[PDB]
Amino acid sequence: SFLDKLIETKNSLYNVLKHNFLYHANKIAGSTFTTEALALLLDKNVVTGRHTLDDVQETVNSSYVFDTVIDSLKEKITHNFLRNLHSSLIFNTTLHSRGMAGIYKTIPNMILGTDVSIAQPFEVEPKLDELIEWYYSQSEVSIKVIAEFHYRFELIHPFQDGNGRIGRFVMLKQMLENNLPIKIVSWDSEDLYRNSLNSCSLGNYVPLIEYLSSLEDFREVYKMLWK
Amino acid sequence: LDKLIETKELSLYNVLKHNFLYHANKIAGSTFTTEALALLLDKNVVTGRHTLDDVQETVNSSYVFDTVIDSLKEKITHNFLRNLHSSLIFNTTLHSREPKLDELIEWYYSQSEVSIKVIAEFHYRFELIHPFQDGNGRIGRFVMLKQMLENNLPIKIVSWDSEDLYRNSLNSCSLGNYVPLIEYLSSLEDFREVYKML
Ligand SMILES: Nc1ncnc2c1ncn2[C@@H]1O[C@H](COP(=O)(O)OP(=O)(O)OP(=O)(O)O)[C@@H](O)[C@H]1O
Ligand SMILES: [Mg+2]
């Protein structure tokens, strides 16, 4: 019943979820928008503070991507769905040219803070199919399923940039679609999210599961808004 | 002008771009200070309080300025003006939504000698025609600048301080009478002498 109410306000439960999610997801990606500045941008289309053009444009894009994710609930994660999310997210940035929007990487990339083996470009499309086919094979989608999906997706790292944000968008989508607790990956001075990721390995996602469990359920925190 | 042309990738060019865009954009309602505009142009960093439209239109004006310099000595056409307009209003809230112009352009290129009088008459007539819904003023000032540059004429930047002299000169003008505008432009300082040191 949470989802219906969320939809019927599309100040509102929707704007709270959007503001919180976008704030943390973008800040993890390096955005310098404060909570007040992001609120002002989302509500009144006014930019304040010091930002790169890319930060401004990508924050604005992230708003549209969030809307798309909510509008496309229950729809299948496909290659084109993911490429369109990426395309919306990096629209009108210094990555739009070169036409890396919205396209899988052609040149090897990396996640720094680690030397873990990222998927080579040629492996992106097949592994992703194997991942998607795996995801929809699950009888019941759980936080554990979503955590494994998240880690594997990030290890694939299909796009040259924006992998973190797109991954967390998809994670939010999966949670919403399966009436699971809404766990919003939050920024913090200690990099608990990143460290939980780095404690993980293929076949071992317990650090991420524990991290997600350590997060509060958004649905309960703002129960006053819907219940 | 040659100095202008080759300090392009590099500076007379950046000084002209910065000053011109500052005044042209401010007249159009931009809230970028001269420092904020400089920071945007040089480091692609946005500071201060601005609407999204202001940010985007300022960035666009940078691109349009570059295009205008690229098209020096090239003939003013309709598609050229439409390209300026499209570039200027790209990614704004203004995005969703002929004969008199042809006549004006041909009239302009028929003159054996281009003068400030010719440019002034062109400017007023362009504003009276008003070919675009928005950005008409900025496009007009871009074109005026182009016309001055192409003919080694004094480079006079319509200034934000100059209002409302510019506006009142425009309101005193009529078809066939452009003397208020000519006197106004004449009252403006020549960019070339101020930055002759460059
Ligand atoms: N040790 C790790 N193991 C697996 N994945 C990781 C690890 N560390 C980070 N990641 C994921 O890789 C993504 C890379 O993005 P990062 O945070 O490094 O900066 P960014 O490139 O600016 O963010 P974005 O990808 O949204 O553009 C992270 O968001 C994270 O989800
Ligand atoms: Mg990035």
CSV table of C-alpha atoms and ligand atoms in Angstrom, one decimal:
chain,number,residue,atom,x,y,z
A,1,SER,CA,0.0,0.0,0.0
A,2,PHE,CA,3.1,2.2,0.4
A,3,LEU,CA,3.7,2.3,-3.4
A,4,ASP,CA,0.1,3.5,-4.2
A,5,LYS,CA,0.4,6.4,-1.8
A,6,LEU,CA,3.9,7.2,-3.1
A,7,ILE,CA,2.4,7.4,-6.6
A,8,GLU,CA,-0.6,9.6,-5.5
A,9,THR,CA,1.7,12.5,-4.6
A,10,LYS,CA,3.7,12.4,-7.8
A,11,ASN,CA,5.9,18.5,0.3
A,12,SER,CA,5.1,14.9,-0.2
A,13,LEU,CA,6.3,11.3,0.5
A,14,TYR,CA,7.5,11.2,-3.1
A,15,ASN,CA,9.5,14.4,-2.8
A,16,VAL,CA,11.1,13.2,0.4
A,17,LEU,CA,12.1,9.8,-1.1
A,18,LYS,CA,13.4,11.6,-4.2
A,19,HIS,CA,15.3,14.3,-2.2
A,20,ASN,CA,16.9,11.8,0.2
A,21,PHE,CA,17.8,9.2,-2.5
A,22,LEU,CA,19.2,11.8,-4.9
A,23,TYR,CA,21.1,13.6,-2.2
A,24,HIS,CA,23.0,10.5,-1.0
A,25,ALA,CA,23.4,8.9,-4.4
A,26,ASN,CA,24.7,12.1,-6.0
A,27,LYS,CA,27.0,12.9,-3.1
A,28,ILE,CA,28.6,9.5,-3.3
A,29,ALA,CA,29.2,10.2,-7.0
A,30,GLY,CA,31.0,13.4,-6.0
A,31,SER,CA,28.2,16.1,-6.2
A,32,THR,CA,28.7,19.1,-4.1
A,33,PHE,CA,25.0,20.0,-3.7
A,34,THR,CA,24.1,20.4,0.0
A,35,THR,CA,20.7,19.2,1.1
A,36,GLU,CA,19.3,22.8,1.0
A,37,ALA,CA,20.8,23.5,-2.4
A,38,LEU,CA,19.4,20.3,-3.8
A,39,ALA,CA,16.0,21.0,-2.4
A,40,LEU,CA,16.1,24.5,-3.9
A,41,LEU,CA,17.1,23.1,-7.3
A,42,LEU,CA,14.4,20.4,-7.3
A,43,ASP,CA,11.7,22.7,-6.1
A,44,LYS,CA,12.4,26.0,-7.7
A,45,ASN,CA,15.1,25.3,-10.4
A,46,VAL,CA,17.6,27.6,-8.8
A,47,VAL,CA,21.3,26.8,-8.5
A,48,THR,CA,23.3,27.9,-5.4
A,49,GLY,CA,26.7,27.0,-4.2
A,50,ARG,CA,29.9,26.1,-6.1
A,51,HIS,CA,29.6,23.4,-8.7
A,52,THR,CA,31.1,22.2,-11.9
A,53,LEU,CA,28.8,22.4,-14.9
A,54,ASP,CA,28.8,18.6,-15.0
A,55,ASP,CA,27.7,18.5,-11.4
A,56,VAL,CA,24.7,20.9,-12.1
A,57,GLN,CA,23.6,19.1,-15.2
A,58,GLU,CA,24.0,15.6,-13.8
A,59,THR,CA,22.0,16.6,-10.7
A,60,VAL,CA,19.2,17.9,-12.9
A,61,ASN,CA,19.4,14.7,-15.0
A,62,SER,CA,19.3,12.6,-11.9
A,63,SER,CA,15.9,14.2,-11.1
A,64,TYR,CA,14.6,13.0,-14.5
A,65,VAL,CA,16.1,9.6,-14.1
A,66,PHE,CA,14.4,9.2,-10.7
A,67,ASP,CA,11.1,10.1,-12.3
A,68,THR,CA,11.7,7.5,-15.1
A,69,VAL,CA,12.5,4.8,-12.6
A,70,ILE,CA,9.3,5.4,-10.7
A,71,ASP,CA,7.3,5.6,-13.9
A,72,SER,CA,8.8,2.3,-15.2
A,73,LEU,CA,8.1,0.2,-12.1
A,74,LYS,CA,7.3,-3.5,-12.7
A,75,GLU,CA,8.9,-3.1,-16.2
A,76,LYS,CA,11.8,-5.4,-17.1
A,77,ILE,CA,15.4,-4.5,-16.7
A,78,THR,CA,16.8,-4.8,-20.2
A,79,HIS,CA,20.0,-3.6,-21.9
A,80,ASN,CA,18.0,-0.7,-23.5
A,81,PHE,CA,16.4,0.3,-20.2
A,82,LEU,CA,19.8,0.5,-18.6
A,83,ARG,CA,21.3,2.4,-21.6
A,84,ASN,CA,18.4,4.9,-21.6
A,85,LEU,CA,19.0,5.5,-17.9
A,86,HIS,CA,22.6,6.2,-18.5
A,87,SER,CA,21.7,8.4,-21.5
A,88,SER,CA,19.4,10.5,-19.4
A,89,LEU,CA,21.9,10.7,-16.6
A,90,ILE,CA,24.8,12.0,-18.6
A,91,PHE,CA,22.8,14.1,-21.0
A,92,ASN,CA,24.4,17.5,-21.8
A,93,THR,CA,27.7,16.7,-20.0
A,94,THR,CA,31.4,16.5,-21.0
A,95,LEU,CA,30.8,12.8,-21.6
A,96,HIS,CA,27.9,13.3,-23.9
A,97,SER,CA,30.7,14.2,-26.4
A,98,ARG,CA,32.2,11.8,-27.1
A,99,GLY,CA,29.1,9.8,-27.9
A,100,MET,CA,29.4,7.6,-24.8
A,101,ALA,CA,25.7,8.1,-24.2
A,102,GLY,CA,24.2,5.8,-23.6
A,103,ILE,CA,26.7,3.2,-24.5
A,104,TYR,CA,28.6,0.3,-22.8
A,105,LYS,CA,32.3,0.9,-22.4
A,106,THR,CA,34.6,0.4,-25.4
A,107,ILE,CA,37.8,0.9,-23.4
A,108,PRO,CA,38.7,-0.7,-20.0
A,109,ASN,CA,37.8,1.2,-16.9
A,110,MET,CA,38.4,0.8,-13.2
A,111,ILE,CA,37.1,1.5,-9.7
A,112,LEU,CA,39.9,3.0,-7.7
A,113,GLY,CA,40.2,2.3,-4.0
A,114,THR,CA,40.7,-1.3,-5.3
A,115,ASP,CA,42.6,-3.4,-7.8
A,116,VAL,CA,39.7,-5.9,-8.2
A,117,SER,CA,39.2,-7.3,-11.7
A,118,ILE,CA,36.5,-5.4,-13.6
A,119,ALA,CA,34.8,-6.9,-16.7
A,120,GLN,CA,36.6,-6.2,-20.0
A,121,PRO,CA,34.4,-4.3,-22.5
A,122,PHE,CA,33.9,-7.4,-24.7
A,123,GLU,CA,32.5,-9.2,-21.7
A,124,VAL,CA,29.9,-6.5,-20.7
A,125,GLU,CA,26.9,-7.6,-22.8
A,126,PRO,CA,27.2,-11.3,-22.2
A,127,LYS,CA,27.7,-11.1,-18.4
A,128,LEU,CA,24.9,-8.6,-18.1
A,129,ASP,CA,22.5,-11.0,-19.9
A,130,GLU,CA,23.7,-13.7,-17.6
A,131,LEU,CA,23.0,-11.4,-14.7
A,132,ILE,CA,19.6,-10.2,-15.9
A,133,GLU,CA,18.5,-13.8,-16.7
A,134,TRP,CA,19.7,-14.7,-13.3
A,135,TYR,CA,17.8,-12.0,-11.6
A,136,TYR,CA,14.4,-12.9,-13.1
A,137,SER,CA,15.1,-16.6,-12.4
A,138,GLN,CA,14.8,-16.0,-8.7
A,139,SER,CA,11.6,-17.3,-7.2
A,140,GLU,CA,11.6,-14.6,-4.6
A,141,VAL,CA,13.5,-11.3,-4.8
A,142,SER,CA,15.1,-10.5,-1.5
A,143,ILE,CA,17.5,-7.9,-0.1
A,144,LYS,CA,20.1,-10.7,-0.6
A,145,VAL,CA,19.2,-11.1,-4.2
A,146,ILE,CA,19.4,-7.4,-4.7
A,147,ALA,CA,22.7,-7.1,-2.9
A,148,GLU,CA,24.2,-9.8,-5.2
A,149,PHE,CA,22.8,-8.1,-8.2
A,150,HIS,CA,24.3,-4.8,-7.1
A,151,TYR,CA,27.8,-6.2,-6.5
A,152,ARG,CA,27.9,-8.2,-9.7
A,153,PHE,CA,26.6,-5.2,-11.7
A,154,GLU,CA,29.2,-2.9,-10.2
A,155,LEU,CA,31.9,-5.6,-10.9
A,156,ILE,CA,30.8,-5.6,-14.5
A,157,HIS,CA,30.9,-1.8,-14.5
A,158,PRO,CA,29.2,-1.6,-18.0
A,159,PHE,CA,29.5,2.2,-18.6
A,160,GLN,CA,32.5,4.4,-18.7
A,161,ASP,CA,31.1,6.5,-15.9
A,162,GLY,CA,27.8,6.7,-13.9
A,163,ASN,CA,27.9,3.1,-12.8
A,164,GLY,CA,27.4,3.9,-9.1
A,165,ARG,CA,24.3,6.0,-9.7
A,166,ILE,CA,22.7,3.7,-12.2
A,167,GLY,CA,23.3,0.7,-10.0
A,168,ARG,CA,21.7,2.4,-7.0
A,169,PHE,CA,18.8,3.5,-9.1
A,170,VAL,CA,18.2,-0.1,-10.2
A,171,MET,CA,18.5,-1.2,-6.6
A,172,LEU,CA,15.8,1.3,-5.6
A,173,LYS,CA,13.7,0.0,-8.5
A,174,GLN,CA,14.0,-3.6,-7.4
A,175,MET,CA,13.1,-2.7,-3.8
A,176,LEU,CA,10.1,-0.7,-4.8
A,177,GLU,CA,8.9,-3.4,-7.3
A,178,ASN,CA,9.1,-6.2,-4.7
A,179,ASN,CA,7.6,-4.5,-1.7
A,180,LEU,CA,10.9,-4.9,0.1
A,181,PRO,CA,12.3,-2.5,2.8
A,182,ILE,CA,13.6,0.7,1.1
A,183,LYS,CA,17.2,0.9,2.1
A,184,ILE,CA,18.8,4.1,0.8
A,185,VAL,CA,22.6,3.9,0.5
A,186,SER,CA,23.8,6.9,2.4
A,187,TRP,CA,27.0,9.0,2.1
A,188,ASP,CA,29.2,9.0,5.2
A,189,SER,CA,32.7,10.1,6.2
A,190,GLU,CA,33.8,6.5,6.7
A,191,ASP,CA,32.9,5.0,3.2
A,192,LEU,CA,30.9,2.2,4.8
A,193,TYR,CA,29.1,1.5,1.5
A,194,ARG,CA,32.4,1.3,-0.5
A,195,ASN,CA,34.1,-0.7,2.2
A,196,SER,CA,31.2,-3.2,2.4
A,197,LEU,CA,31.6,-3.5,-1.4
A,198,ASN,CA,35.3,-4.1,-1.0
A,199,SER,CA,34.8,-6.7,1.6
A,200,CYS,CA,32.6,-8.5,-0.8
A,201,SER,CA,33.7,-11.0,-3.5
A,202,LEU,CA,31.9,-13.1,-6.1
A,203,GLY,CA,30.1,-15.7,-4.1
A,204,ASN,CA,30.3,-13.6,-0.9
A,205,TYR,CA,27.9,-10.6,-0.5
A,206,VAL,CA,27.5,-10.8,3.3
A,207,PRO,CA,29.3,-7.5,3.9
A,208,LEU,CA,26.9,-5.7,1.6
A,209,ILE,CA,23.8,-7.5,3.0
A,210,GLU,CA,24.9,-6.5,6.5
A,211,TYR,CA,25.5,-2.9,5.4
A,212,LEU,CA,22.0,-2.7,3.8
A,213,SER,CA,20.6,-4.2,6.9
A,214,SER,CA,22.3,-1.5,9.0
A,215,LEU,CA,20.5,1.1,7.0
A,216,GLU,CA,17.1,2.2,8.3
A,217,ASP,CA,14.0,1.3,6.3
A,218,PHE,CA,12.8,4.5,4.6
A,219,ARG,CA,9.2,3.1,4.6
A,220,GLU,CA,9.1,3.0,8.4
A,221,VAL,CA,11.0,6.3,9.0
A,222,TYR,CA,8.4,8.3,7.2
A,223,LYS,CA,5.4,6.1,8.1
A,224,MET,CA,3.7,9.3,9.3
A,225,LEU,CA,3.5,10.3,5.6
A,226,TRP,CA,1.6,7.3,4.3
A,227,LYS,CA,0.3,4.9,7.1
B,1,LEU,CA,41.4,41.7,-36.1
B,2,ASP,CA,44.1,39.2,-37.0
B,3,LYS,CA,45.3,39.3,-33.4
B,4,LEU,CA,41.6,38.6,-32.5
B,5,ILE,CA,41.4,35.7,-34.9
B,6,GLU,CA,44.6,33.9,-33.7
B,7,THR,CA,44.2,34.4,-29.9
B,8,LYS,CA,41.1,32.3,-30.4
B,9,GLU,CA,42.3,28.9,-29.1
B,10,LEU,CA,44.0,30.9,-26.4
B,11,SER,CA,44.2,37.3,-24.5
B,12,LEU,CA,42.3,39.8,-26.6
B,13,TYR,CA,39.8,37.1,-27.6
B,14,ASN,CA,38.9,36.1,-24.0
B,15,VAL,CA,38.7,39.8,-22.9
B,16,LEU,CA,36.3,40.6,-25.8
B,17,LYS,CA,34.3,37.5,-25.2
B,18,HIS,CA,34.0,38.1,-21.4
B,19,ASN,CA,33.2,41.8,-21.7
B,20,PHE,CA,30.7,41.4,-24.5
B,21,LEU,CA,28.9,38.4,-23.0
B,22,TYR,CA,28.8,40.1,-19.6
B,23,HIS,CA,27.0,43.1,-20.9
B,24,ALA,CA,24.8,41.3,-23.5
B,25,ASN,CA,23.7,38.7,-21.0
B,26,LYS,CA,23.2,41.1,-18.2
B,27,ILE,CA,20.9,43.2,-20.4
B,28,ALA,CA,19.0,40.0,-21.1
B,29,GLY,CA,18.6,39.5,-17.4
B,30,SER,CA,21.5,37.3,-16.4
B,31,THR,CA,22.6,37.5,-12.7
B,32,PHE,CA,26.2,36.4,-13.4
B,33,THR,CA,28.7,38.9,-11.9
B,34,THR,CA,31.8,39.6,-14.0
B,35,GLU,CA,33.8,37.3,-11.7
B,36,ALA,CA,31.2,34.5,-11.9
B,37,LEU,CA,31.1,34.8,-15.7
B,38,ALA,CA,34.9,34.7,-15.9
B,39,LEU,CA,35.0,31.6,-13.6
B,40,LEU,CA,32.3,29.9,-15.8
B,41,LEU,CA,34.2,30.6,-19.0
B,42,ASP,CA,37.6,29.7,-17.8
B,43,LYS,CA,37.0,26.7,-15.4
B,44,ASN,CA,33.5,25.5,-16.2
B,45,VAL,CA,32.5,26.2,-12.6
B,46,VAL,CA,29.1,27.7,-11.6
B,47,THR,CA,29.0,30.0,-8.5
B,48,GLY,CA,26.3,32.3,-7.1
B,49,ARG,CA,22.5,32.1,-7.2
B,50,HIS,CA,21.0,31.6,-10.7
B,51,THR,CA,18.0,30.0,-12.4
B,52,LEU,CA,18.8,27.0,-14.5
B,53,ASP,CA,17.8,29.0,-17.6
B,54,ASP,CA,20.4,31.6,-16.7
B,55,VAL,CA,23.2,29.1,-16.3
B,56,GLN,CA,22.2,27.3,-19.6
B,57,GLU,CA,21.7,30.5,-21.5
B,58,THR,CA,25.1,31.8,-20.4
B,59,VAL,CA,26.8,28.6,-21.5
B,60,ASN,CA,25.0,28.8,-24.8
B,61,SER,CA,26.0,32.4,-25.2
B,62,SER,CA,29.6,31.3,-24.9
B,63,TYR,CA,29.1,28.8,-27.7
B,64,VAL,CA,27.2,31.3,-29.8
B,65,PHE,CA,29.9,33.8,-29.4
B,66,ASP,CA,32.4,31.3,-30.6
B,67,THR,CA,30.2,30.5,-33.7
B,68,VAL,CA,29.9,34.2,-34.5
B,69,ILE,CA,33.6,34.7,-34.4
B,70,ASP,CA,34.0,31.6,-36.6
B,71,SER,CA,31.6,33.1,-39.2
B,72,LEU,CA,33.4,36.4,-39.6
B,73,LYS,CA,33.5,37.7,-43.2
B,74,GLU,CA,30.8,35.1,-44.1
B,75,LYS,CA,27.4,36.4,-45.3
B,76,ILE,CA,24.5,36.8,-42.9
B,77,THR,CA,21.8,34.3,-43.8
B,78,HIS,CA,18.5,33.2,-42.4
B,79,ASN,CA,19.7,29.7,-41.5
B,80,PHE,CA,22.7,31.3,-39.8
B,81,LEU,CA,20.4,33.4,-37.6
B,82,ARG,CA,18.2,30.4,-36.9
B,83,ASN,CA,21.3,28.5,-35.9
B,84,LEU,CA,22.3,31.3,-33.5
B,85,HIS,CA,18.8,31.2,-32.1
B,86,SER,CA,18.7,27.5,-31.6
B,87,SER,CA,22.1,27.4,-30.0
B,88,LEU,CA,21.1,30.3,-27.8
B,89,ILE,CA,17.9,28.7,-26.5
B,90,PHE,CA,19.1,25.1,-26.4
B,91,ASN,CA,18.1,23.1,-23.3
B,92,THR,CA,16.0,26.0,-21.8
B,93,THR,CA,12.4,26.3,-20.6
B,94,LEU,CA,11.9,28.3,-23.8
B,95,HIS,CA,12.7,25.2,-25.9
B,96,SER,CA,9.3,23.4,-26.0
B,97,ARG,CA,7.4,26.2,-27.7
B,98,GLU,CA,10.6,36.0,-43.4
B,99,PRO,CA,10.2,38.6,-46.3
B,100,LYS,CA,11.1,41.6,-44.2
B,101,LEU,CA,14.2,39.9,-43.0
B,102,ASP,CA,15.3,38.9,-46.5
B,103,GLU,CA,14.8,42.5,-47.6
B,104,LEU,CA,16.8,43.7,-44.6
B,105,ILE,CA,19.7,41.4,-45.3
B,106,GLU,CA,19.9,42.1,-49.0
B,107,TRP,CA,19.6,45.8,-48.3
B,108,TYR,CA,22.6,45.5,-45.9
B,109,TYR,CA,24.8,43.7,-48.4
B,110,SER,CA,23.9,46.1,-51.2
B,111,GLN,CA,25.9,49.0,-49.6
B,112,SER,CA,29.3,49.8,-51.2
B,113,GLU,CA,30.4,51.1,-47.8
B,114,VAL,CA,29.3,49.8,-44.4
B,115,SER,CA,29.0,52.5,-41.8
B,116,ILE,CA,27.8,52.8,-38.2
B,117,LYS,CA,24.8,54.5,-39.8
B,118,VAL,CA,24.2,51.3,-41.8
B,119,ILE,CA,24.7,49.1,-38.8
B,120,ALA,CA,22.4,51.2,-36.6
B,121,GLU,CA,19.6,51.1,-39.2
B,122,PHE,CA,20.1,47.4,-39.5
B,123,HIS,CA,19.9,47.0,-35.8
B,124,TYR,CA,16.7,49.0,-35.4
B,125,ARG,CA,15.1,47.3,-38.4
B,126,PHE,CA,16.0,43.9,-37.1
B,127,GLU,CA,14.5,44.7,-33.7
B,128,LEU,CA,11.4,46.0,-35.4
B,129,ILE,CA,11.0,42.9,-37.4
B,130,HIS,CA,11.6,40.8,-34.3
B,131,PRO,CA,12.1,37.5,-36.1
B,132,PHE,CA,12.4,35.3,-33.0
B,133,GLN,CA,10.2,35.1,-29.9
B,134,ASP,CA,13.1,35.3,-27.5
B,135,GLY,CA,16.8,36.0,-27.7
B,136,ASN,CA,16.0,38.5,-30.4
B,137,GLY,CA,18.0,41.3,-28.6
B,138,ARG,CA,21.0,39.1,-28.0
B,139,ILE,CA,21.1,37.8,-31.5
B,140,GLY,CA,20.8,41.4,-32.8
B,141,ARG,CA,23.8,42.5,-30.6
B,142,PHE,CA,25.8,39.5,-31.8
B,143,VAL,CA,25.0,40.5,-35.4
B,144,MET,CA,25.9,44.1,-34.7
B,145,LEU,CA,29.3,43.0,-33.2
B,146,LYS,CA,29.9,40.8,-36.3
B,147,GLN,CA,29.1,43.7,-38.6
B,148,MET,CA,31.5,46.0,-36.7
B,149,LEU,CA,34.3,43.4,-36.7
B,150,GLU,CA,33.9,42.5,-40.4
B,151,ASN,CA,34.4,46.2,-41.4
B,152,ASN,CA,37.3,47.3,-39.1
B,153,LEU,CA,34.9,49.7,-37.4
B,154,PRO,CA,35.1,50.8,-33.8
B,155,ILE,CA,34.0,48.0,-31.6
B,156,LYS,CA,31.2,49.4,-29.5
B,157,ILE,CA,29.7,47.2,-26.8
B,158,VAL,CA,26.1,48.1,-25.8
B,159,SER,CA,26.6,48.5,-22.1
B,160,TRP,CA,24.4,47.6,-19.2
B,161,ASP,CA,25.3,50.9,-17.6
B,162,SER,CA,24.1,52.5,-20.9
B,163,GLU,CA,20.5,51.6,-20.2
B,164,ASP,CA,18.2,53.3,-20.4
B,165,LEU,CA,20.0,55.5,-23.0
B,166,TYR,CA,20.1,52.6,-25.4
B,167,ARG,CA,16.5,51.8,-24.8
B,168,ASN,CA,15.4,55.5,-25.1
B,169,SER,CA,17.4,55.9,-28.3
B,170,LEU,CA,15.6,52.8,-29.6
B,171,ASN,CA,12.2,54.3,-28.6
B,172,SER,CA,13.1,57.6,-30.2
B,173,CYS,CA,13.9,55.8,-33.5
B,174,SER,CA,11.5,55.1,-36.2
B,175,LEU,CA,11.7,53.5,-39.7
B,176,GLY,CA,13.7,56.1,-41.6
B,177,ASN,CA,15.0,57.8,-38.5
B,178,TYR,CA,17.9,56.2,-36.7
B,179,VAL,CA,19.7,59.3,-35.4
B,180,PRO,CA,19.0,58.7,-31.7
B,181,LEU,CA,20.6,55.2,-32.1
B,182,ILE,CA,23.6,56.6,-34.0
B,183,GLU,CA,24.2,59.3,-31.3
B,184,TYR,CA,23.8,56.6,-28.6
B,185,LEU,CA,26.4,54.3,-30.3
B,186,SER,CA,28.6,57.3,-30.8
B,187,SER,CA,28.5,58.0,-27.1
B,188,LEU,CA,29.9,54.6,-26.4
B,189,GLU,CA,33.6,54.1,-26.1
B,190,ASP,CA,35.6,52.0,-28.6
B,191,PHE,CA,36.7,48.6,-27.2
B,192,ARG,CA,39.8,48.7,-29.4
B,193,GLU,CA,41.4,51.8,-27.7
B,194,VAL,CA,40.7,50.6,-24.1
B,195,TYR,CA,42.4,47.3,-24.8
B,196,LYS,CA,44.8,48.6,-27.4
B,197,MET,CA,47.6,47.6,-25.0
B,198,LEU,CA,46.6,43.9,-25.7
C,1,LIG,N1,35.5,-2.2,-3.7
C,1,LIG,C1,34.4,-2.0,-4.6
C,1,LIG,N2,33.9,-3.1,-5.1
C,1,LIG,C2,32.9,-3.1,-6.0
C,1,LIG,N3,32.3,-2.0,-6.3
C,1,LIG,C3,32.7,-0.8,-5.8
C,1,LIG,C4,33.7,-0.8,-5.0
C,1,LIG,N4,34.0,0.5,-4.7
C,1,LIG,C5,33.1,1.3,-5.3
C,1,LIG,N5,32.3,0.5,-6.0
C,1,LIG,C6,31.2,0.9,-6.9
C,1,LIG,O1,31.8,1.6,-8.2
C,1,LIG,C7,31.2,2.7,-8.4
C,1,LIG,C8,32.2,3.7,-9.0
C,1,LIG,O2,31.8,5.0,-8.8
C,1,LIG,P1,32.7,6.0,-7.8
C,1,LIG,O3,31.9,6.1,-6.5
C,1,LIG,O4,34.0,5.4,-7.7
C,1,LIG,O5,32.8,7.5,-8.4
C,1,LIG,P2,32.0,8.1,-9.7
C,1,LIG,O6,32.5,7.4,-11.0
C,1,LIG,O7,32.0,9.6,-9.9
C,1,LIG,O8,30.4,7.6,-9.5
C,1,LIG,P3,29.5,7.2,-10.8
C,1,LIG,O9,29.8,5.8,-11.2
C,1,LIG,O10,28.0,7.3,-10.3
C,1,LIG,O11,29.8,8.2,-11.9
C,1,LIG,C9,30.8,3.1,-6.9
C,1,LIG,O12,29.7,3.9,-6.9
C,1,LIG,C10,30.5,1.8,-6.2
C,1,LIG,O13,29.0,1.5,-6.4
C,2,MG,MG,31.9,9.4,-12.2
